[PDB]
Amino acid sequence: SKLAAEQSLAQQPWVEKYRPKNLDEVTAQDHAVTVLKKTLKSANLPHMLFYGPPGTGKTSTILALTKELYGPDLMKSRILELNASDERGISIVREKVKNFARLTVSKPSKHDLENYPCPPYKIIILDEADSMTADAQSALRRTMETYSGVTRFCLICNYVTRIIDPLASRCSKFRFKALDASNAIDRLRFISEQENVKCDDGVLERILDISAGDLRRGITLLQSASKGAQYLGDGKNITSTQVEELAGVVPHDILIEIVEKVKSGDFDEIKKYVNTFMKSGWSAASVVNQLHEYYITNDNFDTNFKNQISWLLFTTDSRLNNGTNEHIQLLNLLVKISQL
Amino acid sequence: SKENLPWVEKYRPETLDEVYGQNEVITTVRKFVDEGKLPHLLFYGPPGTGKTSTIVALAREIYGKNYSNMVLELNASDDRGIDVVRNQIKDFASTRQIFSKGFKLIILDEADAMTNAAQNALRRVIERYTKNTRFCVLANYAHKLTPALLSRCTRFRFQPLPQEAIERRIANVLVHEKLKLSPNAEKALIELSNGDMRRVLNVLQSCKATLDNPDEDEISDDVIYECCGAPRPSDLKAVLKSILEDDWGTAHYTLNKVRSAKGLALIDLIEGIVKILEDYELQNEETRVHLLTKLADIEYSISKGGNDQIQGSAVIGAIKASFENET
Amino acid sequence: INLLSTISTTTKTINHENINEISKAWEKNIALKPFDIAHKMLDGQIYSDIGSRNFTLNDKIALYFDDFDFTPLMIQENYLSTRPSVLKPGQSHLEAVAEAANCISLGDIVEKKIRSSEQLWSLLPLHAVLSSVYPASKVAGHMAGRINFTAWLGQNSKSAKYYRLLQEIHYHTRLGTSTDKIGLRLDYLPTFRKRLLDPFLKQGADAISSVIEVMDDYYLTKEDWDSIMEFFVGPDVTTAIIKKIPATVKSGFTRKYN
Amino acid sequence: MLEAKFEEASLFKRIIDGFKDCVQLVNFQCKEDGIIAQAVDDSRVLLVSLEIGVEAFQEYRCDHPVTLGMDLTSLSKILRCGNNTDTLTLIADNTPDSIILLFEDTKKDRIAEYSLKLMDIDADFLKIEELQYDSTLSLPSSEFSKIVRDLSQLSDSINIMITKETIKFVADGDIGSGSVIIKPFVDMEHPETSIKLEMDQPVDLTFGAKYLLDIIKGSSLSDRVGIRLSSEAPALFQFDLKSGFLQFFLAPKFN
Amino acid sequence: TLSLQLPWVEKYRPQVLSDIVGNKETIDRLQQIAKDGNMPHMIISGMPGIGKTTSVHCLAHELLGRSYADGVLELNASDDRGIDVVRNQIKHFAQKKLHLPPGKHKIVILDEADSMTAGAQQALRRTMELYSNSTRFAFACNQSNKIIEPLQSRCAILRYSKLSDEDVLKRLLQIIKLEDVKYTNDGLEAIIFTAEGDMRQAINNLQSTVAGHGLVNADNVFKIVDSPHPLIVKKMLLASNLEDSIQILRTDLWKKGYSSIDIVTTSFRVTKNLAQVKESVRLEMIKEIGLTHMRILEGVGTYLQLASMLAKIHKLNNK
Amino acid sequence: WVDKYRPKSLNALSHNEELTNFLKSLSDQPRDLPHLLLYGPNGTGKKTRCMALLESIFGPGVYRLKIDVRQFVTASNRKLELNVVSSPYHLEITPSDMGNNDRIVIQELLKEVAQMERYKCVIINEANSLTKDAQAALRRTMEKYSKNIRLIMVCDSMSPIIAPIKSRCLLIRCPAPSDSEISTILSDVVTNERIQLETKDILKRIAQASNGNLRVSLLMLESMALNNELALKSSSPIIKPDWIIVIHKLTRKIVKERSVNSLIECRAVLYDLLAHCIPANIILKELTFSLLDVETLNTTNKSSIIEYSSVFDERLSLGNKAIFHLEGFIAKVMCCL
DNA sequence: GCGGCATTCAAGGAC
DNA sequence: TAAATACAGACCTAAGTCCTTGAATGCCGC
DNA sequence: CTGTATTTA
Ligand SMILES: Nc1ncnc2c1ncn2[C@@H]1O[C@H](COP(=O)(O)OP(=O)(O)OP(O)(O)=S)[C@@H](O)[C@H]1O
Ligand SMILES: Nc1ncnc2c1ncn2[C@@H]1O[C@H](COP(=O)(O)OP(=O)(O)OP(O)(O)=S)[C@@H](O)[C@H]1O
Ligand SMILES: Nc1ncnc2c1ncn2[C@@H]1O[C@H](COP(=O)(O)OP(=O)(O)O)[C@@H](O)[C@H]1O
Ligand SMILES: Nc1ncnc2c1ncn2[C@@H]1O[C@H](COP(=O)(O)OP(=O)(O)O)[C@@H](O)[C@H]1O
Ligand SMILES: [Mg+2]
Ligand SMILES: [Mg+2]
Ligand SMILES: [Mg+2]
């Protein structure tokens, strides 16, 4: 039972092993968990709409809230979780969701009332609402306003724009903030100490810097670094360079060579260097991000140069987001900023 | 108990006197239902402007406390089909009332979703059974309604609620709850609303939960901003000022520190900057063209993801390049 | 006959004086065939000032909407085969065709966004102008040759059949390739042809055993062997190479397979 | 804690089959005096009011009033799971949730335990109609069902006319017309065949055919049905049960 | 309140062919057909609220006299568009025996005929062919293209057009005279202007204005009935400077609650029907509005996208 | 000889020693293992590395695999057929063999192996072809069942992969082998296969003709052995795949004559290439890269060509009709020249 | 044991 | 053998729901 | 439009 669950958590990846179980474990999203904790003493949960960058902890936050509200017994009876892996067309929204909302809340047992608030409403979580079609969203719209007495709707999404405006109007919007170094260094340090991860001074902060507001990717990075250090058995500390090597970060010397090739060199040499560079299989997004950081941070280029380099990097990133060939886009970027 | 419902549903108007914002529509509707000439209504308006609430209050005033039985309310969550029209709407219009004597009412809430075939079948039902029942169509969008159905109903364009009415509604809420609001906090609340009372009620309850105290304190602009995550106006002008005259390195550092100190979103700052520069007096239009085009493309790219720092530097560069034409 | 019966009740005499209102109120508004739609859309007179005043843009969108499933296909097929008459001063045919193809790409993007999830069918008017009206306007003029029917359907069907055949081949050979469908098509096949077909050309009928062994090593079949030779193009087309092979070798190979 | 024990398990099934097509969701109000239920059609054209007293139940125990919101399309299947010679037991806890139906055989030993999840119908159902009608008639249920199903084929509207000792059903459609005329007669040799009529003012008004076909589906409960009409008032179709009754308040068409 | 009174659309609905102020030629043709008899198969097409259903109803009434109840089969085609309906009910009515005067026929009215399914539309052809000597068909639709070509082959075609301002004004003045309503010339001009040739809409607006304010004056009409939405958009695109277009978009459209999708659809429709600018400019403007509409339909709909639309149109107009 | 001489374990790998050490570190504790995403250039051998990692995590019986057939029903009641590679310890799924019905085969079947089950590995081959709906469906499925199902997704480019999918799995890059390492593998192959080389440098040249690809290198060597009869001389011609010569002829036609009459011929060539099981993205990449190699053009032309190729690559990724964008790209290239 | 009717579902079409 | 005009080349697939519609399934009534 | 089938010159 409990021992089996603790063993299973101990033999699971750190992403799920240290998934928050209570509202106190949510570190940086204080403005949302404060309201979620205050509404626990009361029973006036509104319809909620969680939105933000991936890996900020919306699913973990809602799971912890539902646990704290219902207990491990009623968690399986008063919760309807529909993911992006399930059919959510018009027929599904009209049949299953509406029938569940129309049903009365399950009667809690004697043990639930003594330890948990046990609100008289149930929660339907709808994860990844971006994929839901707008007409199904209108069905949800009119489902969420008449049966609000016994059911509470919580949409979770990555892009708020994919949901129609009235649906965002009926639900209280909760923005999950990007988890950079400042607000997630405590969580990363706690995770590292819980696994006896002996690292250097600026490793965890560097991990969150490469994460770019994503604690899941940072946790996976720390896990991979820990396994890599444990395999060696040398007993030393994980270094920042070792972190960025397996994180897909281009080394500084390669980036410098790219800068020299763009600065001095014609189209042929630049094309040859791009052809050689794509052999190493670097991710295009990381290369564009590193070029952006180097060009914006370095105070040797003129402001008119800065405007155009920023616009070209933005255009290339937008093109690369929509499933394009990395080599062609990177070559176009290098050539266009070479003529500058 | 009503204390269990959220503020968005707790404070739903029950009578026509609690529906604020709309005055030219409410008095006309009251005169229509008092003198007896109630034609087929079409409430077209943005979300949260109070169409469903006012139609429910009208039906309650017309029929009494037993509204839930003498009025046929069809909505988008229903089947919205053509067969459902043919059976249910035709039977309800043709038959008489089971509880009292009088005309019947059909509220087709969110009828923009209604299929073209359903509206085609309905446009004859409304015209034929017009002596003993009335039709009310509520719509956020009017293009989804066929012109033939559009021309059979008297159109009422619900406008976003102005300052005074929404301020009065927040005053009523602060009367009902042991709560107080700062004047500047209330002004920021109104500014961040865009004529949506649903947003106001939701964020008001959220900040009430945020207060962390038994409510002997006041809700200031800080509480509102840290609860709803909107940028402060001060930070908005600070970011724009650093972009405008300060150095690229200093401007980038200022934007990063403002956006990371309180975890702000790039889209919120972008919208605030667009609103702020809309009052800027510019001699030529080319700079405005470049600003609008680049900012709209950046917003569209943000709406699909990507690199956040690249997007912020793109905003900075777009603003600087657009205003480089103002020499 | 119906028009004569209906109109003679009021006007006992019909003359050349009133014929304009007779014809204007009894016009046959029938959907034109896709060939006539392509002919009308690619007419250079229509996009002139007089033509624009007479045949307005709404009529162009209606002509597209008469058959919206084939109009973009025909327009893309036969827009670069018309002699232009609306070229701007300083613009050649190649530039106009390039702009038309750019608008064709935009129209295809719109069509994909329409015929995919979220059912953005209200964008149909947009697809009216991006796929058909604008590209035709760019290259409007006279018809040089004949209006060929769109060949994209036939090439699509042929590509789908070839993709199905490649799927069968790859799922047969997965036990040895451990390579994806495209990876086996691009690289494995130029070697498979040389392993199977070249020994027949260079050694005669004594290389049947080696080819059979090679094909059984990868679980290849007679139908699979026939389908393999149909994938190569360009300087390596086997449609005549197999016929050059002596019939005795083919008969022996078929007997060995049997 | 609600605990009801029926005499025969098929009596509840016969009650529910009356509501099967004209009603989707019901709110059973359970009190010390019996079970009450009121429902409105999806088109809101007819109203169903059922009352079954404590007499029909072999055993009854209702500690506090209970509200049981339930769907008929599932309860019909659940009752169809019983037998002709079974007995039915309704169980509900202190908090209304997941009503339990127990089928027990009296000839043998068998336990059939079924569950039904309750649903929250926000609209309350407690209204009572008490008004004098212009005409009150009583006729065998089988005969009235026969006339309704016979005249439903001609058209979708059936007109009922009550005149001095004359009862008229008129159905005028596209394939023709039809008229059934009856007189109130007293049958001493069998009392359940006679037709009674007490009229205060002539009545003439029209109903829809399909709703009449849905109401006459309740003829399996009682052998005689009462029909009460009034001007500008709903029509009362009443099947009298042993412990209570079932009444359809059906609304006429506008002229 | 206990009851309502009949709307002026129904109360003053014409019952004779002379009371209709529509197209004079077709109305006179219908009067002559009713006077002489032998009504042929017909389809009446046009825009909403110009007197299509009313014309056919009065024609059938005048043609059949007291036999309208048993000689007229009026069905909303959108209500009954099944092929089974044509196979059974329409067929039975067509074969039904009825002793009629020697110049009158049974009339089948198919209201909203443009919504009939393909199967019923094809099945109706032989039904109207085999019983063409005792059963006549009158279709009422808004788009003739939705009716199959063979169906149009067997019938007269009556294209109704938009009502002229004079006819609408005359009908309105007759209604005021029959209702004793205080009015003003500017108010009636505003009613006609916002009617856009739809007599039903004009009548409804007049009745609503009378019931809400009592006096038909231009101020009241523009207060209760907004000016035509496409005209503000048309003024918005045709602005000479970007500042003016942004001002109209902000004040008249965005601050008044008009949704972004409505604005982009209206701009698309206006530019499609525009005639002031050249063809190439119109196509390029439609390209830009369509791109912005594509952006809006993904849920990106804000004021910034519409501002970009106007800025890019003004760049296009800037040579 | 693509499968005759192929490593079967981590100790049998012969290039990217750091990558092999990273795989060994990840396989030291196989129970505490996150989801994996192997990305890199096509033909590097990342599938071989994932197979070796599986053979390290489980017993040597991983390579003993079988092909089964599964039938699924979509929303249109169609009978979609999927051939699935299964092993007593792992299974492989390639959703790239169908159209927009990938999400279906993503959602149901994985649940079937997620609800039936210390873990069973799932290998998603060619995750680039996964539609965004399929990736969204996989998004929560990867997290809900992490104690029974672990994903190992192989792709050549993470550009079409959405951000949540990237964050939910560890990322491993597989750089293309260096020319010296490729030459070493070629020398081992020709020594074991008894191939006669008068000079070793020939092998090196094959590497410079492979652009880092190992699959292409070995298959080109096999193509070379049959023309020269198992003995390679100093001037053995380089055998290119037929589509490469077709594309090269297309570039020659583009750079030689620029008109709509030649545009029709280019349309015919593109249709012929597309009808024979060849992706449009690869066609565009090879066409642009051969256009860039033309010495007649200057930097002004090449910059415009690469800009158009990127723009039309975006169009093709946002489009469905390949010719509709390839024709536009070639037309703009003709306009530039 | 059929006879009849009602219900449901799958195939094609439309946007 | 030419005028003179009609007029035919050709039909796509995944996808989303709604709608129709034939036909099979299912049940009750007799 | 090109190309072909049909009717009339
Ligand atoms: N605020 C947080 N505090 C602590 N751990 C966190 C936090 N956010 C994320 N994590 C960690 O990251 C893991 C994944 O969190 P999720 O809730 O799945 O992220 P997400 O917001 O759901 O992103 P998605 O699912 O792609 S929209 C959790 O199990 C935690 O280990
Ligand atoms: N004019 C108003 N006066 C008072 N409260 C209002 C007003 N408008 C909106 N509200 C509040 O907002 C809530 C939701 O309003 P609704 O009328 O349901 O929204 P809506 O106007 O119908 O737009 P929808 O539902 O998106 S189509 C109500 O329950 C009120 O609490
Ligand atoms: N030409 C007209 N003359 C008088 N009244 C008209 C005319 N056209 C429309 N109406 C009014 O419009 C109402 C209904 O119009 P109707 O004929 O149903 O519109 P449609 O032509 O779209 O069917 C009628 O009550 C009638 O009074
Ligand atoms: N470590 C290695 N040493 C030698 N050859 C290798 C090694 N890894 C992979 N290969 C070669 O790569 C081929 C498989 O490539 P594959 O993995 O299918 O390409 P991709 O990486 O594009 O999936 C095998 O034939 C094998 O010869
Ligand atoms: Mg999640
Ligand atoms: Mg509403
Ligand atoms: Mg009409």
Residue numbers in the entry:
A (entry chain D): 14 to 353
B (entry chain C): 9 to 335
C (entry chain A): 518 to 775
D (entry chain F): 1 to 255
E (entry chain B): 4 to 322
F (entry chain E): 4 to 120, 134 to 353
Quoted passage from the original study:
Clamp loaders place circular sliding clamp proteins onto DNA so that clamp-binding partner proteins can synthesize, scan, and repair the genome. Here, we report the discovery of a second DNA binding site in the yeast clamp loader replication factor C (RFC) that aids in binding to nicked or gapped DNA. This DNA binding site is on the external surface and is only accessible in the open conformation of RFC. Here, we describe a series of structures that reveal that RFC has a second binding site for DNA on the external surface of RFC. This external DNA binding site is composite, consisting of three domains of Rfc1: the (BRCA1 C-Terminus) BRCT, AAA+, and collar domains.
To elucidate how RFC binds to gapped DNA, we determined the structures of RFC:PCNA bound to DNA constructs with 6- and 5-nucleotide ssDNA gaps. We chose these gap sizes because we predicted that the 6-nucleotide gap will bind without the need to melt much duplex, while the 5-nucleotide gap should be too short to bind without melting DNA or altering the clamp loader structure to accommodate the shorter linker. We determined the structures of RFC:PCNA bound to 5- and 6-nucleotide gapped DNAs to 3.0- and 3.3 Å overall resolution. We find that both structures exhibit the p/t duplex bound in the internal site and the non-p/t duplex bound at the external DNA binding site. In the 5-gap and 6-gap structures, there is clear density for a single-stranded region of the template strand that connects the two duplex regions. The ssDNA linker interacts with a series of mostly conserved residues from the AAA+ (P461, R464), collar (P551, F552, F587), and A′ domains (F666, L670, S674, R681) of the Rfc1, with some additional contributions from the E subunit (S79, R81, N104). The ssDNA region traverses the same path that the template overhang does in our structures bound to p/t-DNA. The ssDNA region in both the 5-gap and 6-gap structures is 6 nucleotides long, indicating that the 5-gap DNA must have melted at least one base. Indeed, for 5-gap DNA we see clear density for base-flipping of the 3′ end of the primer strand in the internal DNA binding site, similar to what we previously observed for p/t-DNA. On the other hand, for 6-gap DNA, we observe scant density for flipping of the 3′ end. Neither the 5-gap nor the 6-gap structures show any sign of base-flipping at the external separation pin.
